[PDB]
Amino acid sequence: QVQLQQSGPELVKPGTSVKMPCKASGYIFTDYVISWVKQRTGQGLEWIGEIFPRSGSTYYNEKFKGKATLTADKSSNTAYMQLSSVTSEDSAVYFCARDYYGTSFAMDYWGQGTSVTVSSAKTTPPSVYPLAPGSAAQNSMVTLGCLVKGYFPEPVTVTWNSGSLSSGVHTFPAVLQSDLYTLSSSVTVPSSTWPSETVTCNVAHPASSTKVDKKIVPR
């Protein structure tokens, strides 16, 4: 199982640095090149550069030379990207990629991406509020939700019954208002499931290391 494991989300102050790890398991880490790729919010992908971990020789996109610095630790099969003197322009998701250089020349494995937000705004944890349905005539499926309000930065992840409830879920992209994000999620389940059973929504905010579970009770 070729897997590339990237750190959870980063808030970093303007003018300072972030150093981000990509931990490689399932193959001979030194037989493959690691490529790093940037993706600004709702934009295309942009290749940052590549490191040959066996030698440590690096190549980049010339836009990022002197902004991004790539290293590797052969002992711990872990590649790293440092970004120095960062600006709002550096805010993005960053991936690492296994790069089958010398044969396919393609990035066959991608880590899950690291969200980097550049701001001197404070880390704030979310308030998670249950959305239990009111008085209405709307009667075979019931829809419930969670309001995740007043957190910085992105992201939060939301799961229902810790991931058991996957179909019929809609999590809506957060919206920034005055240094603070708000997001919402909905789950749609049979009328035979709730409230006879438990539907709990799980909010992770890794920036502030928050995990909250909000049980959806009626009324």
């Binding site: 942009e46 010339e62 393609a106 990035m107 308030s127 209405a136 992209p173 919402s184």
Partner: protein, 219 residues
């Protein structure tokens, strides 16, 4: 620096229909010795990290449906989806690795389908949010097509525009629909004053708005 170019930038077709998409490079990506074009095609579905589809211009990677096919050579390249599925919603990027790495700007595939009126649900404030002084009324307008939809909030019959926050999901990969959350946020005092709260959805599928409401003082 090899520049890469995709057209069209957006693209919308029905399930089961064919779609082709174009990728041009500023130089030839063909290596005369190996006989291979270093041009790859990737798929990035919404929320997910990219996935390698094809390498050497025409060689389909593992874990990729046979409906995907790559072709071309030199400086002109094509991706054919021979029978598009709902799951194929995504941006498709071509990328050269002939020298360094360059990604195209992306070709967004939107899926077109039979219209659907939205399932609307309205949720009063959580008792927990009202304890803190705040009052958010949330409306989920789920599983609709096409994406254009207006929402309006009435308070005791009068429209309200300040304090609303709206958020659209990307198209669903299973049924090709869209969804939206709309949240009307108020103080508890302001919420406590009035009695009727009403969420109206205007969509192509009816000329009559879909209306959902609740009375604060009721069950």
């Amino acid at each position: 620096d090899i520049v890469m170019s995709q057209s069209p930038s957006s693209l919308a077709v029905s399930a089961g229909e064919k779609v082709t998409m174009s990728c041009k490079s500023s130089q030839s990506l063909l290596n005369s010795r190996t006989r291979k074009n270093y041009l790859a095609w990737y798929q990035q579905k919404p929320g997910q990290s990219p996935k390698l589809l094809i390498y050497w211009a025409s060689t389909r990677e593992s874990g990729v449906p046979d409906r995907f096919t790559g072709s071309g050579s030199g400086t002109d390249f094509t991706l054919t989806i021979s029978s598009v599925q709902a799951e194929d919603l995504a941006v498709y990027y071509c990328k050269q690795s002939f020298y360094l790495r360059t990604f195209g700007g992306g070709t967004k595939l939107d899926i077109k389908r039979a219209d659907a009126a939205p399932t609307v649900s309205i949720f009063p404030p959580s008792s927990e949010q009202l304890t803190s002084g705040g009052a958010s009324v949330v409306c989920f307008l789920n599983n609709f097509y096409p994406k254009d939809i207006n929402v309006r909030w009435k308070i005791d019959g009068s429209e309200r525009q300040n304090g609303v926050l709206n958020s659209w999901t990307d198209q669903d990969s299973k049924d090709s629909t869209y969804s939206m959350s709309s949240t009307l946020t108020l103080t508890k005092d302001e919420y406590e004053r009035h009695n009727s709260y009403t969420c109206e959805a205007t969509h192509k599928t009816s000329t009559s708005p879909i209306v959902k409401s609740f009375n604060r003082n009721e069950c």
